[PDB]
Design a protein around this nucleic acid. Structure first.
Ligand SMILES: [Zn+2]
Ligand SMILES: [Zn+2]
Ligand SMILES: [Zn+2]
Ligand SMILES: [Zn+2]
Lengths: 116, 66, 140, 1131
DNA sequence: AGAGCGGGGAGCCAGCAGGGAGCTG
RNA sequence: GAGGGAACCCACU
DNA sequence: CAGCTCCCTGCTGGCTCCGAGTGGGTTCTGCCGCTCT
């Protein structure tokens, strides 16, 4: 999927990808100082176009306490089996295409979120 | 401001009935029974005593210039 | 001249509920209406007590005293829910330390209210316009 | 004990009556002015820097405790007197109180100690005092004490008296400050921008706005730049973070991106990092910013100082204006970039400009504070100029000569008099209409004007978004009351129980947050931010908290018992984005709601019982606020509450909609304003008709104030017999409408009779009108003073004799007395003279400048008042009284937007009659109802018939299940009438029964100010304008009507060329010029000696007479002034 | 010496800076 | 038997 | 064949328009200090 940034350790800054042809490998070489670092993953730039299927990481579980969010009893939790859940929709521009309900368990300390 | 002399719609004299209406109200008549005791049978006169605002009592609180 | 008026939370209890499930879910919808359970143990009263609030546990434990020694584990359920940054020391049941923490917190709230009320109005001086009443002839 | 549903209507109207017994209707104006006088003026005086003048000895001038007197008048004798408001109204005085400040001057001399001189209570100007505020003379007076002062106890106050004119300050909707707002700019180089109108709290200084924008795609990616204040180009945001003192990249990205496992935030900050890579040092970044400032520097050191002071005092002033505050300012800038990234990723949603959570309301307080800030800065500038001019040469300055007391006085007077808000020298850029002449036409006009809001948006804007009825106006702003025409949706009115927050100090909230487990931003690692809830106080990010349940519950518990959190403090929790925002600033509009906990009201029967005896428990609304029962909720906090419309919503339903209601409405009919709460059954009407009635209830005629005899208003309308409505709402008790009513209950038959009521007209009863039905008086007051214009021009009130006075309008002066004024009781006509003023010119020494009556206005002089104005001249006001009998063409309206003109008047024997001999007072057309859909009119007629038969006063509160059409129909059938209000009417002309049965009943009609005799106009010939020699403007100047361009187009399409010439040439401005036949320029033409001569050609025989409009000659001469030659060639 | 004079949107057009072609010595 | 302009605000259809 | 010339296109800045007709009101010109007796 998405690969994170790499940070220099000496001057506390960003690293940058580079290809060293001596070993013909990929190193993350800072360009404020002389720090170098070999790369665990070869993926440098990565993009998602229709890979927006996972709205669940943007959902935080705290929304179970919202008094304005709708509660249902017909969708029990899988983790703890509580009857109460809150259901809503994903509200991004990249979720105008869908009206999928996302559910969050109402009970404290559970925090399980699901769809359908 | 002050009670009209006549009912607007028909012309029944209602100018002599405001103080009687207030005295009947402070005698704990209901407004319908107070209007009925004054002989106001058409609702055109009953609105004339019922909806009256007697502003002249409050205009008499101001000290006279003349 | 009646006005039609009603709302509905759209969607998409179809459940085989037997005796114990019906009893526990009735109690899970009317928790607060319990005066005294009689002589019921903790194991059968396990689920509804989990879905319960510490004021209701206080009311039950002051009405059903003999149950307190079998409620203490559930109090840790409250403790890690509310006072998660704490551990009890030696010889500390969770119920009495939970009530000690609650009483200490509400007393700290009262002390803070008292302090901030005196240390913001009665202690300092806020600069304000006062009546002059000079009748000065500075402006003639 | 829970309030059972049979007692709930009484309970909610009891708590509403308690609210309107304590707070009143103009509370927001009085509160803002009181907080301005007590706190804001002193803050402005103290926060002004001390004057440090050195030529040399050094003078330090410090300003200290201010002192404000009561409103006093000083005559020409100089003796102070207490100024009553009626004296200020009559004598055209400005109702102002003198403002005295304490000044300390310290002298510093070479080798010598200080010298401190205490000018205690130095006069620096006069503050105009708002009526019935704390510092007014009418404060604390009872109704008897107000009537002894010839004041009205029903008069709300809330206005100023400037030159005898009552001025109201209209509240202005500004954008909310200190809050990050992200919008997608329409068709711009930035895809998303994030602004913060930053302003440091409790300090009147202009807001400094910083933009954090993200560029459009069509380089590698998306670049975030920063439009700083006073930096005229777009600095990249990483360079701003470097200039704040952050060389590293984990520093900057920990300030921006709080969770480091999130990749998309990093992939969008990557272009902004990689575009600003070449700048790596703090002072290098400072140079890069300061090189593109408004004032560049040739020296690098000067540029470093410039960028440091810009980022110190101008960029985000609210988070910090002082040193060592780089971490809090940098966290807030990172929060702005974070919100920009969240909105650009789509994770968060764009802000709404029309949401009144995003808008504050500048009332009289903040507006007068802005004025007084500018004017005190001007006063200090004048003092420093005077004292520097002295200590340049002279030994010392006396300070009372340096204090220009006209600055504060005349500046406040000018801005409150003209409405051009700001300074007079910049009037073209000053916002107008902030101060308006208070509408005194009826009491509803006065209250509506005193509760008025204004969007500072141009009224020519074709975009509809600020004009739309936004969803967030519920309960704060009236949904019906708005003007028609160019200001629809921009000028608004408050709802009845809406209260605008007056302002509070953020401090005690900040100490409470410090001692309630909030970790400050200055003492945390950023790694703790990613799962903790950020806390904002007045838009200032002050820390984070890890238990937001207990913090929000603790804060709400404190606010509900009038502890540390005062009642107007707004506390919003955004759960989805992990934020707690606390707003204490002024301008937030809020309303009280009942608190619902566990699906039960906290308002129980004991509160209602205690409020039932409000006079003898000293129980009031404030005790309900202290009891944790009611709660003030504003617009942002209303986004997080779950409202119940009625307590019936709290009851369990077969289809349960919500079981987590947080608050409940007191009564939904408090979404309406003052003028929309007069409408009976507003919910049965179409909403344009509600808006029309909100407009026309301000033009109705009634008794506008109780002391109308004392007042000399320019225009006043008083109804002979105003009646309270038979069909009232329960909100009409708190508008005092049954004490100053503005209409009469007519007997209205909705019938087709003789055709004279068609197309909105009405047919009135001539016999009813003869008995005083809708009869009124129009009072007009004329003012005139003996102005002394130098030594020569001495205007004096003398009765003019033709033997010594010139420049007359040739009218009789016989009704004037020998003091030059007319006397009360004299009939006057449109040509007559009421004031005889003569001016002395350098035989006819005197010129007649007599004040004449208005044209075609019959009347009788009601009062003459003679006084001295502020300048000591003789000043007179004459009130003329004209009795206006209802007439064909007078505009009458009901309370449902059924306006119309009287089309005919029939006598009693001519109007149709019921079997009881009841003839209608008004007949309206049936066709006025169907497309209008004013069913509230029909129900008002039905309910008024029931109320007039029963003797009750009918209740028509909008949302009331206890009143419905079937109940009223059964009640009407119980009195021997047809249940649907129809009656068998007989034709008045023939006696025959009308085949249809006519819907007749008592309906509350009001007479509008738009009388036909105040609008009829005609002209044959008369006054022409000076410049273009065309007829004048308006019927007041005997002017002509405009035959505009579309009339010209219509007469072109008619083909009527000669009528077009008559209108556009003969009937406007015929003229003849003489034109040279060679050059075409207009030529000199002595028509006395027949000497026609054209210079430039030396032509004397070939000159032609050309007929033109005079405006064509004026145009051609303006063109020849413009170095253009229109050569009018006759061949 | 007081009296009096002085000092917002929307949409179209025009000029200039970038191309890409052709041209000549 | 005819001696101000301008700015602004409100209102009307 | 490299550098110069010479016309298509892209950009930014400048410019001009924004319904018709009516009442009524207030407030401003004008802004104050001087040099001469
Ligand atoms: Zn490095
Ligand atoms: Zn669960
Ligand atoms: Zn009658
Ligand atoms: Zn010529």
């Amino acid at each position: 999927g998405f690969v994170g940034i790499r940070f220099c350790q000496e001057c506390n800054n960003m690293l940058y990808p580079k290809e060293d042809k001596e070993n013909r490998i990929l190193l993350y070489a800072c360009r404020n100082c002389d720090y170098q670092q070999e790369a665990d993953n070869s993926c440098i730039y990565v993009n998602k176009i229709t890979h927006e299927v996972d709205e669940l990481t943007q959902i935080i579980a705290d929304v179970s306490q919202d008094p304005t969010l709708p509660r249902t009893e017909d969708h029990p939790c899988q983790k703890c089996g509580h009857k109460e859940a809150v259901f809503f929709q994903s509200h991004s521009a990249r979720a105008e295409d869908a009206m999928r309900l996302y559910y969050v368990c109402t009970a404290p300390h559970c925090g399980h979120r699901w769809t359908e | 401001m002050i009670i009209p002399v006549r009912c607007f719609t028909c012309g029944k004299i209602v100018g002599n009935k405001w103080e009687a209406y207030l005295g009947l109200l402070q005698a704990e008549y209901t407004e319908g029974d107070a209007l009925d005791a004054l002989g106001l049978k058409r609702y055109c006169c009953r609105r004339m005593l019922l909806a009256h605002v007697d502003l002249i009592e409050k205009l008499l609180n101001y000290a006279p210039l003349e | 001249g009646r006005r039609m008026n009603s709302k509905m939370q759209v969607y998409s209890l179809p459940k085989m509920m037997t005796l114990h499930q019906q009893c526990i879910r009735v109690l899970k919808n009317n928790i607060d209406s319990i005066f005294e359970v009689g002589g019921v143990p903790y194991s059968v009263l396990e689920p509804v007590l989990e879905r319960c609030t510490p004021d209701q546990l206080y009311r039950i434990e002051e009405y059903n005293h003999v149950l307190i020694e079998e409620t203490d584990q559930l109090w840790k359920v409250h403790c890690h829910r509310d006072f998660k940054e704490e551990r009890p020391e030696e010889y500390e049941s969770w119920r009495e330390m939970y009530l000690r923490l609650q009483d200490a917190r509400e007393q700290r709230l009262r002390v803070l209210t008292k302090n901030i009320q005196f240390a913001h109005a009665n202690k300092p001086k806020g600069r304000q316009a006062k009546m002059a009443f000079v009748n000065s002839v500075a402006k003639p | 004990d829970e309030i059972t549903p049979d007692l709930w209507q009484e309970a909610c109207w009891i708590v509403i009556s308690s609210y309107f017994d304590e707070k009143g209707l103009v509370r927001q104006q009085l509160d803002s002015f009181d907080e301005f006088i007590q706190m804001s003026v002193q803050r402005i005086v103290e926060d002004a820097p001390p004057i440090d003048l050195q030529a040399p000895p050094r003078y330090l001038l410090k300003f200290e405790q201010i002192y404000l007197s009561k409103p006093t008048h000083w005559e020409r004798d100089g003796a102070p007197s207490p100024m009553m408001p009626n004296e200020a109204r009559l004598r055209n005085l400005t109702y102002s109180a003198p403002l005295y400040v304490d000044i300390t001057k310290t002298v510093i001399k070479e080798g010598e100690e200080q010298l401190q001189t205490q000018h205690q209570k130095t006069f620096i100007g006069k503050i105009p005092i708002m009526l019935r505020s704390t510092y007014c003379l009418l404060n604390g007076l009872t109704d008897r004490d107000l009537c002894e002062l010839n004041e009205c106890p029903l008069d709300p106050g809330g206005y100023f008296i400037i030159n005898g004119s009552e001025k109201v300050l209209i509240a202005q909707e500004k954008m909310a400050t200190n809050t990050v707002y992200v919008f997608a700019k329409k068709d711009s180089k930035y895809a998303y921008t994030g602004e913060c109108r930053s302003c440091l709290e409790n300090s009147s200084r202009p807001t400094s706005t910083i933009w954090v924008s993200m560029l459009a795609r069509g380089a590698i990616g998306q670049r975030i730049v920063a439009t700083l204040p006073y930096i005229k180009q777009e600095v990249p945001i990483i360079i701003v973070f470097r200039a704040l003192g952050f060389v590293s990249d984990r520093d900057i990205l920990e300030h921006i991106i709080y969770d480091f496992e999130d990749p998309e935030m990093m992939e969008m900050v990557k272009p902004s990092l990689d575009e600003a890579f070449v700048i790596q040092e703090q002072n290098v970044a400072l140079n890069f910013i300061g090189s593109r400032g408004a004032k560049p520097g040739v020296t690098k050191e000067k540029r470093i100082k410039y960028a440091k002071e810009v980022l110190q005092k101008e960029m985000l002033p609210h988070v910090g204006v002082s040193d060592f505050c780089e971490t809090k300012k940098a966290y807030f800038l990172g929060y702005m970039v974070h919100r920009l990234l969240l909105a650009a990723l789509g994770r968060r949603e764009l802000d709404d400009r029309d949401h009144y959570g995003n808008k504050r309301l500048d009332l009289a307080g903040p507006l007068l504070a802005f004025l007084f800030r500018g004017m005190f800065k001007n006063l200090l500038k004048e003092v420093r100029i005077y004292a520097q001019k002295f200590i340049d040469r002279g030994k010392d300055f006396n300070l009372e000569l340096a204090i220009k007391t006209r600055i504060i006085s005349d500046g406040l007077k000018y801005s409150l008099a003209t409405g051009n808000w700001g300074d007079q020298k910049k009037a073209h850029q000053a916002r107008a209409g902030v101060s308006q002449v208070l509408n005194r036409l009826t009491f509803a006009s006065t209250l509506s004007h005193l509760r008025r809001l204004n969007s500072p948006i141009g009224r020519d804007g074709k975009l509809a978004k600020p004009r739309q009825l936004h969803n967030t106006l519920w309960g704060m702003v009236c949904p019906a009351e708005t003007p028609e025409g160019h200001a629809v949706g921009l000028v608004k009115n408050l709802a009845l129980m809406a209260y605008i927050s007056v302002g509070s100090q953020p401090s005690p909230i900040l100490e409470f947050l410090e001692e309630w487990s909030m970790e400050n931003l200055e003492e945390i690692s950023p790694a703790a931010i990613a799962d903790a809830t950020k806390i904002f106080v007045n838009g200032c990010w002050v820390g984070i908290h890890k238990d937001p349940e207990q913090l929000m519950n603790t804060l709400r518990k404190l606010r509900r018992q009038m502890d540390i959190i005062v009642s107007e403090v707004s506390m919003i929790r955004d759960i989805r984005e992990r934020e707690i925002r606390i707003y204490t600033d002024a301008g937030r509009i809020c309303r009280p709601l009942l608190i619902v906990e566990k699906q039960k009201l906290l308002l129980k029967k004991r509160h209602i019982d205690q409020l039932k005896e409000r006079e003898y428990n000293n129980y009031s609304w404030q005790d309900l606020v202290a009891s944790g029962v009611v709660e003030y909720i504003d617009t942002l906090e209303e986004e997080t509450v779950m409202l119940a419309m009625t307590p019936d919503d709290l009851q369990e339903k077969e289809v349960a909609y919500c079981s987590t209601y947080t608050h409940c409405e007191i009564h939904p009919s408090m979404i309406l304003g003052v003028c929309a709460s007069i409408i009976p059954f507003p919910d049965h009407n179409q909403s344009p008709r509600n808006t029309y009635q909100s407009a026309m209830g301000k033009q109705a005629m009634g008794v506008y104030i109780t002391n109308f005899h004392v007042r000399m208003d320019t225009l006043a309308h008083v109804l002979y017999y105003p009646q309270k409505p038979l069909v009232t709402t329960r909100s009409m008790e708190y508008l005092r409408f049954r004490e100053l009513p503005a209409g009469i209950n007519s007997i209205v038959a909705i019938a087709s009779y003789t055709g004279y009521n068609q197309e909105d007209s009405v047919i009135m009863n001539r016999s009813a009108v003869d008995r005083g039905f809708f009869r009124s008086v129009f009072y007009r007051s004329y003012k005139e003073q003996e102005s002394k214009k130098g030594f020569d021009q001495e205007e004096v009130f003398e009765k003019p004799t033709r033997e010594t006075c010139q420049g007359m309008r040739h009218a009789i002066y016989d009704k004037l007395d020998d003091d030059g004024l007319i006397a009360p009781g004299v009939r006057v006509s449109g040509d007559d003279v009421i004031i005889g003023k003569t001016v002395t010119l350098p035989r006819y020494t005197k010129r007649d400048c007599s004040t004449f009556l208005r044209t075609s206005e019959t009347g009788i002089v009601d009062q003459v008042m003679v006084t001295l104005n502020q300048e000591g001249y003789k000043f007179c006001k004459i009130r003329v009284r004209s009795v206006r009998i209802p007439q064909i063409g007078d505009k009458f309206a009901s309370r449902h937007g059924q306006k119309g003109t009287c089309g005919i008047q029939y006598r009693q024997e001519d109007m149709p009659f019921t079997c009881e001999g009841i003839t209608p007072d008004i007949i309206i057309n049936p066709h006025a109802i169907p497309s209008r859909m004013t069913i509230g009119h029909l129900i008002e007629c039905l309910q008024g018939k029931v109320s007039a038969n029963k003797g009750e006063i009918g209740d028509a509160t909008p949302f009331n299940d206890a009143v419905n059409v079937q109940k009223i129909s059964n009640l009407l059938s119980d009195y021997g009438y047809h249940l649907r209000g129809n009656e068998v009417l007989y034709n008045g002309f023939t006696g025959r029964k009308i085949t249809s049965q006519i819907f007749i009943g008592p309906t509350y009609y009001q007479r509008l100010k738009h009388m036909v005799d105040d609008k009829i106009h005609s002209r044959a010939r008369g006054p022409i304008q000076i410049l273009n020699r065309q007829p004048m403007e308006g019927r007041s100047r005997d002017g002509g009507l405009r035959f505009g361009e579309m009339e010209r187009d219509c007469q072109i399409a008619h083909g009527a060329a000669q009528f077009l010439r008559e209108r556009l040439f003969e009937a406007s401005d015929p003229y003849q010029v003489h034109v040279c036949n060679l050059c075409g320029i207009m030529a000199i033409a002595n028509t006395r000696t027949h000497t026609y001569e054209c210079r430039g050609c030396r032509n004397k025989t070939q000159i032609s007479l050309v007929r033109m409009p005079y405006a064509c000659k004026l145009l051609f001469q303006e063109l020849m002034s413009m170095s253009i030659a229109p050569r009018m060639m006759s061949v």
